[PDB]
Design a binder for these strands. Structure first.
Lengths: 83, 84, 88
RNA sequence: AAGGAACUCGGCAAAAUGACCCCGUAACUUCGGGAGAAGGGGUGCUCUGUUAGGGUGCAAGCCCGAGAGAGCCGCAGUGAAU
RNA sequence: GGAGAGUUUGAUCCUGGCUCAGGACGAACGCUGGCGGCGUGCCUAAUACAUGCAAGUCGAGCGGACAGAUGGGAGCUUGCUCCCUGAUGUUAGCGGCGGACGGGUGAGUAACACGUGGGUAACCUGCCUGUAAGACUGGGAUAACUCCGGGAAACCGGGGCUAAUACCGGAUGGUUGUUUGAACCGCAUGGUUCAAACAUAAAAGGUGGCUUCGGCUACCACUUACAGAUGGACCCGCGGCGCAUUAGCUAGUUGGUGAGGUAACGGCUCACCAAGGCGACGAUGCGUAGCCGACCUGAGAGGGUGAUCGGCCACACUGGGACUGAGACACGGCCCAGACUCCUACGGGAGGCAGCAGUAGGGAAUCUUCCGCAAUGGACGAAAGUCUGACGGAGCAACGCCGCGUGAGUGAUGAAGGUUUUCGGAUCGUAAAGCUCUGUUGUUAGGGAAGAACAAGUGCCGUUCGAAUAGGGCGGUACCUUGACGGUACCUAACCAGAAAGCCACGGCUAACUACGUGCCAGCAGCCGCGGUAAUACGUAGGUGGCAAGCGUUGUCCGGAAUUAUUGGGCGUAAAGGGCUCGCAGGCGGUUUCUUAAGUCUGAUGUGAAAGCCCCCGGCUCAACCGGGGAGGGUCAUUGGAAACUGGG
RNA sequence: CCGAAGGUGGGACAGAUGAUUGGGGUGAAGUCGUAACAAGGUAGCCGUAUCGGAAGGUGCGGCUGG
């Protein structure tokens, strides 16, 4: 009613776009965990570079917030360097 | 610049039975709003024993801290007097 | 954010303004951080009272006054002191 | 089929429950009971597992098989019987 | 700074309750009613809402549009009609920022909700500052616009096209993570700073002016880090409630290890173990309740309240959820389910006044469907400006407080008339009329403030940038502007006592008395109690008394009430000693001395916001009220002295 | 997976209402006695049992508030 219809519209746009970025971030971190449970070194390292890339870009755009980004990066780093 | 000092108590151990912790009766005691006489109250706190070096009936100091779990906000400082 | 702004006090037909360091968020007569002195408009002459050093203290942490509070600072002369400090 | 005790002297007869495990359980009470009250849930097969855990054995290997996860089929897994 | 009185009796003294005299309301009711100032005005149904507004803005981010005509031509009827891109204005859409503030309500909520004091080495923070580094190189879509198609609408889908300060790659980065060295410091987890490498993580341009056309610069904006500031988070001590005719309550409950999750610590969430946790110092349960600054009463201690104003909280038709965004799980956003209202072409849609006005209902009961953004805030903008039911005002109500009124000086014929009378008079009583006179107010008519400071626009001057006197920022002047209230408060002149007083009581408490009617009837009453033919108690008249645009009644608080007694009461016989013991917890503890410092006292520091009570001055014609300045209030935290007493050894 | 609502079920608390009932209070000079107050005409009362239209009586123990 009170011309928040543009905020509803762009809210749905940013919802869809941010969910793409979040899901790519999730699949990258999950790819790291899959290449740690399988005991690979080189693919795990290139997956960690990919995952930290996804995490820092998701922080650059929006709402992942370097504290929780640091949580994800730190656990993925400890689990690749635990090999 | 020495940082701000946390709250400290001394007390008496009620129980040892929880894993790596105790509870502590602080017996600080105070007067009324109306009749003025000074009456006593016992406050038992949940406190962390990381070495579990405690016994029931032990005079002990505790430091306050960040919340260590549900109901825990305290840890040991100096186990002063042991039970007999 | 932090703004030195007038704050309404007084009767109905006779206003009065305490020059008051508040946020833009907070209500006009509501909560506020600290105050410097006063402002009588309804005197037929002048009569502003500004603390002139604690106001200066709030200007430098970053607190931009409203237009009438700014020109009251100019009338007592604290914006010139602030410009001398920035030229320092 | 639909209805469901309208049958009837009267739910007579028939139908329905009907195993094992877990949960939960009233009035009253002579304190024991009531009580299997009631009312619910899960029960197949497969792989994790010759398992967790026990019995025998000196060990091998034989029995007994709670619990969980994953999954697979069916309208239906105490798939019949009682 | 502290008042009592009636009532148990034939009479009395105690005990003892009851009743009264006071002050207050967001009060209502009844009678009555003049103005001005300032405040307040759904306490009830957190009942339901017709309508109107209550959140938009930026063309200096962007693409397309609509107009418009500086010049340029066009065709003729002298009536007219285009097409090039001038300035110039208008803004569906993208986009950014705001919508999370401001305004309402008190339903929930008995615990970190709040107050007060802390802790965070366990945290987040857009816009704002200040400083430091930067800002390169490309890419692909999309709204609008069209062209279809589907819909009753709400609107939706398909193909085309297009830009950004939109989005996405990419480079460079002192963030963040990892790994290795150091250095110093704590309160257990740990903290701060230095270095190296590895992995990534940026960014955007727009306006003006200068120009050799490469660029260069200011302003705004963009990115990263570090501070400040501000807002937010979580955690702990203390504190503020009724019931025990609520005694047992828990099981993610109580801990552990590990993981996830969070801005962060955490059973916050999950696996696996352990049997814990709260408890008569009142757990749990039930009932009630927003908390506070404050407000009313009181000598005070207290008791009651939680309206306005201000802080924090929680809520948004009911329950749940997330989205986006720095910050929401969002009053005027979204998705879902329920009830209700509405529309429907029956397929499906829309809605949420506990925002300002107003309506209906409930009720003893509380207002205008108003003017303005002039002032103070907000949002956006570079600004002009726009939006703003916040806010300024205005209207209604004696709803409260306060101030001025309805006349004044003189006046004995004590006039008329009332009421009473032992009929001598007394009284209404100098009160009317007589004389004299004012105009606050009433009215008419003129004059007319403070509330305005500004913003922006010019000109200067100093100064920082600059390749530069461009040009812009910053500061000081020096002008031109801006009022809804409103020709309102206010001042000045003219006129007439002319327009302006009521309510309650009169036995005592309790100030104030007679007469006539009534006859235990009508009725009064707060109590003692009146009234049954001589009623100062009923009804009326006169009078008096109290107050006064108020007065009286009611409803609740508090006092009186020493009637919950801490201040400040009691128990032989008035109410009250358990039938008595043994004793757990609790309370209390003879003496001398040393020591400690929890209690106690004292100092310093911070703090208990603003308003309020109080003191001192100031301004409204005084007052209410406003304003300034101070004080006060903590069993509060840290810190320092004392050691008599209580406690500790 | 969680999950609001809804559904089924058995309990818990709380308010109404209910034929009938039991005690209580107050009321126009109602009926029966007269239990208490005096040595109240059987001293009274307390506890307890029992009986009786009813106050009450009687037993036992206690008390003077004979």
């Amino acid at each position: 009613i009170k011309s928040a219809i543009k905020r509803t519209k762009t809210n749905n746009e940013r919802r869809v776009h941010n969910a793409t970025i979040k899901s790519a971030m999730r699949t990258a971190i999950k790819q790291v965990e899959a290449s740690v449970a399988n005991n690979e070194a080189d693919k795990a390292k290139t997956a960690l570079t990919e995952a930290a890339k996804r995490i820092d870009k998701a922080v650059k755009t929006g709402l992942v917030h370097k504290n929780t980004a640091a949580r994800y990066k730190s656990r993925l780093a400890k689990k690749v360097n635990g090999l | 610049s020495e940082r701000n000092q946390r709250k400290v108590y001394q007390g008496r151990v009620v129980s040892d039975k929880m894993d790596k912790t105790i509870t502590v009766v602080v017996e600080t005691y105070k007067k009324h709003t109306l009749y003025g006489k000074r009456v006593k109250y016992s406050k038992k706190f949940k406190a962390h024993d990381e070495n579990n070096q405690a016994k029931i009936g032990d005079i002990v100091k505790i430091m306050e801290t960040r919340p260590l779990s549900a109901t825990k906000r305290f840890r040991l400082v100096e186990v002063v007097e042991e039970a007999v | 954010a932090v703004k030195i702004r007038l704050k309404r006090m007084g009767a109905k037909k006779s206003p009065f303004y305490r020059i008051v360091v508040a946020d833009s968020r907070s209500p006009r007569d509501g909560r506020f951080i600290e105050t410097v002195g006063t402002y009588n408009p309804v005197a037929k002459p002048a009569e502003v009272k500004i603390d002139e050093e604690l106001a200066l203290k709030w200007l430098q942490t970053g607190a931009k006054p409203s237009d009438t509070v700014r020109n009251l600072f100019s009338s007592q002369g604290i914006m010139e002191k602030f410009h001398n400090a920035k030229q320092g």
